[PDB]
Design a protein around this ligand. Structure first.
Ligand SMILES: Nc1ncnc2c1ncn2[C@@H]1O[C@H](CSCC[C@H](N)C(=O)O)[C@@H](O)[C@H]1O
Ligand code: NA
Lengths: 265, 265
């Protein structure tokens, strides 16, 4: 008689929580979307096999325009689950769907799963030091998004780290790489000339968090701009002022140049 | 030869991921710490039964001072797990433990799990809007720390939300309640007179995130300062200016007063 929002986790089907799996196994109907993020280590089948149910995958349009016509009607007389990559309410507009559920007289519950937002901890950067986050969006036609550049500036001015979600166009099989993000940022810097993002800027790249062997790299843009970080998904991070131990981790674990060990306090 | 950092999740024993559970079950030795946080919805016994291994509990000193003498030696010739509440490497000093592992010639891998950092998305507040985070600490003796107040000030001023962790004495099993945090903040405001935290400030309280029935409440301090939010753990958030969609969620899901739709947007 309820609707469950269940996160699938970072990388593969095993990133779901035990709680999420046991509840998903007993739901009458299971829906999911795979446009808000990319789970590079699994397939729909592997997820269906684990949960033991057929899964109706919905498009962005099905959800944003027809969630109350496709999913909610069933939750009024059945236990329904809506599954998503990572945590269902992180960097998505899915929270608003709980409002739609309420208006349709449907109770909803949320089962969390590991999210890229907290996975940044594996970069060695203190998570409490992250400031406002942003998304590097693909330019479209004459429209060239740039607000994410200002976020970095605002955070850097405060000595805070900046988490940059990268764009995704699932229907086009498009997943922005950290390289493409760095190129776009260099272009905005050329236009705004704020000294925010240059070839000498230290950045951190995290690719395929959740996998056992994610790619964790730190260094200057000039050096990483063309480095191969492996398959998507990727996130780009622009650190603010570093603590001694953050620099030590970036060097020992992320292969950063030993020169960043020397911090200018 | 391998050390696994495994997150336990948010609330109870089912908050660990399928990946984390299967890996823990294959480890020869399993260690855990509950000094950074406690799994309020479960017990050591229930966790132990689920994993089917005896769990070696470690104190803050065991970890910070002797991780390399207690955990790493065993990791040399066995598969060892180090489990922590939430997502591994979120606690500020844990990332450095991977450096110790490296120095000991021990391979380490991270198995993620839900963290309050991402779980707060259930409050309906957009994750990208959170700024620097902080912890509300109890004053004691001649020491009256107030940095967390400045963090709120710096975030709000930029239209950002502030995630506030509340003081905890794991050993004594003493939790600071949201009610106590609000009282402390009002006291700090009376001192700095910054107009940052008053009876008219809008706050959000999240209790028992991870549970199927968490407490999510939003409203003005004057109305919530004496409200019962249930058993801990409690998390306090001071939102910046709200996106109308954030406000609508708080009203419809968190029982916030209609007033926020015009006053805090
Ligand atoms: N495993 C992963 N590794 C690296 N980046 C990831 C990732 N999962 C998600 N992202 C990043 O986040 C973007 C999707 S944003 C949606 C995030 C999701 N709800 C969560 O909780 O993680 C991707 O385009 C990518 O930039
Ligand atoms: Na944050």
């Amino acid at each position: 008689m309820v609707l469950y929002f269940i996160g699938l986790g970072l990388y593969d089907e095993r990133d779901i929580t035990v709680k999420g799996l046991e509840i998903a196994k007993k739901c009458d109907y299971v829906f999911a979307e795979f446009y808000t993020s990319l789970m590079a280590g699994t397939t729909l089948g592997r997820i269906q096999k684990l949960i033991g149910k057929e899964i109706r995958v919905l498009s962005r349009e099905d959800v944003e325009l027809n969630f109350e016509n496709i999913v909610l009607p069933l939750a009024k007389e059945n236990d329904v689950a809506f599954m998503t990559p990572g945590d269902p309410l992180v960097a998505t507009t899915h929270a608003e769907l709980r409002i739609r559920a309420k208006r349709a007289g449907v109770e909803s519950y949320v089962i969390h799963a590991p999210s890229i937002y907290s996975a940044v901890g594996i970069t060695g950067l203190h998570i409490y030091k992250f400031g406002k986050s942003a998304t590097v969006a693909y330019p479209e036609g004459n429209w060239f998004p740039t607000s994410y550049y200002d976020v970095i500036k605002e955070n850097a001015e405060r000595g805070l780290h900046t988490l940059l979600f990268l764009d995704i166009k699932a229907e086009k099989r498009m997943y922005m790489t950290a390289n493409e993000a760095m190129e776009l940022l260099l272009k905005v810097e050329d236009m705004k000339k704020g000294g925010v993002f240059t070839d000498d800027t230290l950045v951190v790249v995290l690719a395929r968090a959740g996998s056992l062997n994610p790619t964790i790299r730190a260094g200057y843009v000039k050096d990483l701009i063309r480095e191969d970080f492996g398959d998507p998904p990727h996130i780009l991070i622009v650190p603010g002022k570093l603590h001694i131990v953050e620099a030590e981790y970036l060097v020992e674990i992320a292969g950063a140049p030993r020169e960043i060990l020397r911090v200018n306090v």
